[PDB]
Symmetry: D2
Subunit: 302 residues, 4 copies
């Protein structure tokens, strides 16, 4: 909401005068009301002012307090999730308010599935879920033809609380992607590929695996797309295991290990742990012992 | 610009009715004008509507045509750069119009530095530059206390067309960062660090190099920060060369080479070729022959 | 043959006089006959003289022409083999004189097996072989209780021209070794182990494989034993495969590859080539692709 | 000494009759005395018999008790050394007997130098040594023109108890080697090069180091030479350090390290330790930190 004050702050910082901003855009008096936060500001006007100051439209919006995912109701409900995770106590109270609201907006539905995500983790019983989901997804997706970041977010969520086959039908129509709509969007569409790929690999479903690999590679060709490098790495590690599952070939295995280790080296222990675990499982599956190096870390993480 | 039609498109797609959007926000009639793109829309109204649809405010703005860096005059001028790079022909004409406008805004200055960057690359003579920059930078930065993404952008540009010492003064006040203002912002501030660190390492300036490493590792601690993985890697390769230049230590050297290789593996040949080059040079400086692996690639893809 | 002349040569080199050699061993006159090569010399006398000069008994023997594997008839026939290898032309003529003499001495049988090794390699047909071997082996080994270097040598030969099962019975009673009888002896008894272990590994016969590994490790504890380092290395590489085949374990595979490379690094191309090849085959069998590094030499050696 | 019995044992083992051995060599009765160990046996006869049996001349001699380095006085005195090493108590008594006999034969000198080696290790004072060696070495080598294994043995010994400079002049004339005189000889000549190369590398004397490398690589061209693989490896490691000292180059460093590690992998911990230590010292000398892997091994080797 407080865009005007941020405009003032930036203007003064750069030693511009009000006239430098408002002239040919609005009257002096109107502009002062804008800058006082007493008049709301059109996207257009703000975009113009942004040009004049020279600082970036989205940075201004973010300094004006949209960086915080809080200034509206849905935002607050989303922040609520991480609280409820660390303190499952709070679940039932809030979940009872959210379960009915779930189909209000795609955002709400994504929040809902965040609840279910927690419920599965803490063994909490949510009978409603199993009754409703198939019908929910039907309602939400059956006559859909365009999809937005929020749908990919939803799908990552679904992947995390449902069998892959109950999700895959919903995924396939949203890919391939042909435009970036900002780094925020870019990241969302990637997250789905990365999780789906992991699952396909873990299930030894090499056809779906290949698909996800292509879809990701395909993103790289998009204009102004913004690839997550940690993702590029991890997906590359998966591509590496894929070539090993397809051709049990030793360099691919070595490469996979090497990438796992590189996450450790650059301090991304989160990822290191998961990949160490995956690798051990996938090796077990293929009747195979990973390097002592990694079963080392494995047994100590757990 | 066309936010209203995007609202509509998304509305219908989700099978919301107009009332679902506008009620308790504006009159039915006024909404219809918004949706028709005939009435402008306040940030606050749009934010509200975004909540209603369930799709993210920024995504909507970007579908509405802000993802293109072209809907305003400064944007177009920015696009012009890559054109003029690939066909230096066009330089003179445009640069004549831009050199004068360079202090109009930070954006214009950054654009101006892009032209200089090109001129350097194509040996084009730009006498104005050497006369003006010290003065320009003084104008721009002498009485400055808060800095925005665009300043970091400018700083990366400067690093790339001026000696380090001529820029370091300008950099140091902008760090440490203490807040993210979006992934756009977050990338800009990292890019400076990366480019500066690379130069500090390449100059064997280990004090500055450490500073940049620290400023990068600090970013990690910022809330909602969004670290570039490719940078994380590259920086890390630099950290590795750093421990090697301080302690002439073999593991460090091997890790550096390993990282070089990983970029190769993941298809980042741009980066792979730069790092191979660096490593070669740093090695030569320390009277040292890099693995045959790396000098092989160097000769069939750099020499 | 010419030991006396070597004694003179060494004696004068060291500025001893004849008396310094012969005194308390034989008369002046007799010694001069020995030194002229007109009287033969007892092992005991030569040993004593060896002590007085200070140069080593075997060195003197070897300088007197025992280094050359030629000064006797069997020696010559052994040398003959490598000639007949490089020009199979000469086979039939010689092989016709040898095949009948093959049970004259263990030496002769070893030479005969050399011919068969050649015949196998150049596809020459030797029907006599298949008819006689089982009988031959029976004749040679049925009532044997001690074994000599030559037997080991024979066994290596056998391993190289027969299936393992037809040989293993003959091998088993020759191990464990408990005495060294010189470096010549020591080498022979190791060669058998190495070949046998290679075969076992190749056949995935892990029980016999481990037996051979143990027999080799046992040699190491023998007093004055003389272990061949190239063997130690190669056997170690095979131990490393063994652990891999028993436990599909990656460090073992990498070590094995590492050893292969070490042979290349030190210029032992012969060995490098065969190990590259083996590893390739072993990898094939376990549905596995060796590092690209080694599949390069496998193609370009061929 | 007991050759006759060995001949009998072998004869009977192979089911030869006396006549098969003695015919055209000696009378039946004579042969019986030979086989009884009542008549001594000429090298030439023994060689002939060796042919007839089909087992190797040297093996037989070794089975007859020459494998033990004990059946003569000098032999015993050499065995004494390892005893006196593990219990320096015994030193003074024995050394008093040996110090005066040291110039009796090269063998005795070699033994004598083994005493000095011990003395040096246990800080025992041997003033005689420093008085006499220069003159001793002058006495032994001033007028020499050919050299035998024992001289190389002596030179290894001297390298180990004297400064390099005081020994080099003595080494140079003995190389390059042009003939193998058996595996025993072959090893002795290699040992000197190894040790000398080590010292040259450790003193950073790259000219001598290169000389020794060349001398060793020359041996490999010798006909019937028998190269020690462990030495081949270690000298290769040294070559590898040599390239690194000459042109501070990373792949050579890497390779040296690798070799060090191979020794460990094949269980040769004696050598592993020495090479780890050397590498650490050379590294320190060049202002350089070896891999943490190897300084972990230096940390506890103290």
């Amino acid at each position: 909401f407080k865009i005007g004050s941020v405009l003032k702050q930036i203007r003064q910082e750069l030693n511009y005068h009000q006239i430098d901003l408002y002239s040919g855009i609005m009257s002096k008096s109107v502009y002062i009301k804008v800058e006082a936060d007493s008049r709301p500001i059109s996207v257009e006007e703000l975009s113009k002012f942004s040009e004049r100051l020279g600082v970036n439209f989205f940075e201004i919006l973010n300094r004006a307090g949209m960086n915080t995912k809080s200034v509206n109701e849905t935002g607050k409900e989303k922040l609520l999730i991480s609280k409820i995770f660390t303190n499952p106590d709070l679940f039932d109270k809030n979940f009872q308010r959210i379960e009915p609201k779930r189909l209000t907006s795609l955002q709400y539905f994504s929040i809902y599935l965040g609840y279910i995500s927690i419920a599965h983790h803490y063994n909490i019983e949510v009978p409603t879920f199993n009754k409703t989901i198939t019908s929910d997804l039907k309602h939400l997706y059956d006559k859909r033809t365009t999809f937005f970041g929020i749908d990919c977010e939803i799908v990552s969520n679904l992947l995390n609380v449902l069998p892959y086959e109950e999700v895959s039908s919903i995924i396939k129509p949203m890919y391939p992607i042909v435009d970036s709509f900002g780094k925020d969007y870019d990241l969302t569409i990637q997250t789905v590929l990365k999780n789906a790929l992991t699952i396909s690999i873990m299930n030894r479903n090499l056809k779906e695996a290949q698909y996800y690999i292509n879809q990701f590679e395909h993103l790289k060709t998009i204009k102004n797309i913004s690839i997550n490098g940690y993702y590029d790495l991890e997906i590359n590690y998966l591509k590496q295991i894929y070539q090993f599952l397809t051709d049990k070939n030793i360099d691919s295995y070595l490469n996979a290990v090497n990438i796992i280790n590189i996450f450790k080296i650059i301090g991304k222990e989160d990822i290191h742990r998961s990949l160490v675990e995956e690798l051990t499982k996938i090796s077990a599956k293929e009747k195979f012992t990973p390097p002592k190096e990694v079963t080392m870390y494995y047994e100590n993480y757990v």
